[PDB]
Amino acid sequence: PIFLNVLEAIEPGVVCAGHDNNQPDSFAALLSSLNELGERQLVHVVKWAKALPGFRNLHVDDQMAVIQYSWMGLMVFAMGWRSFTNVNSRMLYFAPDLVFNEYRMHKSRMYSQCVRMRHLSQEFGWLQITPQEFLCMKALLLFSIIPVDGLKNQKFFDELRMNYIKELDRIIATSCSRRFYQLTKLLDSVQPIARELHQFTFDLLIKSHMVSVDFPEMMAEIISVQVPKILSGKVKPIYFHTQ
Ligand SMILES: C[C@]1(O)CC[C@H]2[C@@H]3CCC4=CC(=O)CCC4=C3C=C[C@@]21C
């Protein structure tokens, strides 16, 4: 009741990219649209996270940090879910006005990464993830990447993360054990994907001026300030099982 009531009530609604589907696809136009969509989704991720049960118990500085580190994985996870519920994972449903088909996957120069994300999407089907499990897993996904040196107040974070794990546990509840195993495995699988995208968007930002790919304000900031901390090993994901 209560926990899930909150997660359902705060789930963001549909977000459009504002892409112009009439002009021919192209590396520059597709990625620039994705970046605009990224900026827009970021606004929602922030509002969503701040409304999560117990989130404000975290030190104010830790709050923005965990959101900026988890942003990529969060977007990837929700996207895979939208792709599964809308186009049965046949394509990547980034937004109602920005669906990637085989051709866009290739023209965006993100084919292998898109293949990886499509696999994630398909897993929602293969595992028959319920909407409730999806919401719990997405929440937990927000608390799955932190600085090696710890946050301002690691204790509140560890406590909060532990609670979201217990919540996923209740929703699942020798079948419980098997289900918990496969869902935590799925959650772990998001990280390697998020890392490839972190590397890709970072490289893209550095040469964005040469390829005509625009990066909105807040994203350009996150990719140049928070993402390199992840790429250089200062910030690491928290895996359930050893990789
Ligand atoms: C194109 C790029 O710069 C590299 C990877 C892209 C990511 C891929 C994951 C993603 C999922 C969504 O549903 C919203 C937009 C979205 C992105 C928008 C811009 C990024 C960060």
From Swiss-Prot:
Changing residue 239 to F: Decrease in CSK-induced phosphorylation. Changing residue 231 to F: In AIS; almost complete loss of transcription activation. Changing residue 112 to N: In prostate cancer; somatic mutation. Residues 1-223 form the NR LBD domain. The keyword Phosphoprotein applies. Changing residue 179 to H: In AIS; strongly reduced transcription activation. Changing residue 198 to Y: In prostate cancer; increases affinity for testosterone and androgen sensitivity; increased transcription activation. Changing residue 47 to E: In prostate cancer. Changing residue 190 to M: In AIS and prostate cancer. Residues 1-242 are annotated as: Interaction with LPXN. Changing residue 31 to A: Alters receptor specificity, so that transcription is activated by the antiandrogen cyproterone acetate. Residues 1-242 are annotated as: Interaction with KAT7. Belongs to the nuclear hormone receptor family. NR3 subfamily. Binds DNA as a homodimer. Part of a ternary complex containing AR, EFCAB6/DJBP and PARK7. Interacts with HIPK3 and NR0B2 in the presence of androgen. The ligand binding domain interacts with KAT7/HBO1 in the presence of dihydrotestosterone. Interacts with EFCAB6/DJBP, PQBP1, RANBP9, RBAK, SPDEF, SRA1, TGFB1I1 and RREB1. Interacts with ZMIZ1/ZIMP10 and ZMIZ2/ZMIP7 which both enhance its transactivation activity. Interacts with SLC30A9 and RAD54L2/ARIP4. Interacts with MACROD1 (via macro domain). In the absence of ligand, steroid hormone receptors are thought to be weakly associated with nuclear components; hormone binding greatly increases receptor affinity. The hormone-receptor complex appears to recognize discrete DNA sequences upstream of transcriptional start sites. Transcriptional activity is enhanced by binding to RANBP9. It is linked to Androgen insensitivity syndrome: An X-linked recessive form of pseudohermaphroditism due end-organ resistance to androgen. Affected males have female external genitalia, female breast development, blind vagina, absent uterus and female adnexa, and abdominal or inguinal testes, despite a normal 46,XY karyotype. Spinal and bulbar muscular atrophy X-linked 1: An X-linked recessive form of spinal muscular atrophy. Spinal muscular atrophy refers to a group of neuromuscular disorders characterized by degeneration of the anterior horn cells of the spinal cord, leading to symmetrical muscle weakness and atrophy. SMAX1 occurs only in men. Age at onset is usually in the third to fifth decade of life, but earlier involvement has been reported. It is characterized by slowly progressive limb and bulbar muscle weakness with fasciculations, muscle atrophy, and gynecomastia. This is Androgen receptor. It comes from Homo sapiens. The lineage of its organism: Eukaryota, Metazoa, Chordata, Craniata, Vertebrata.
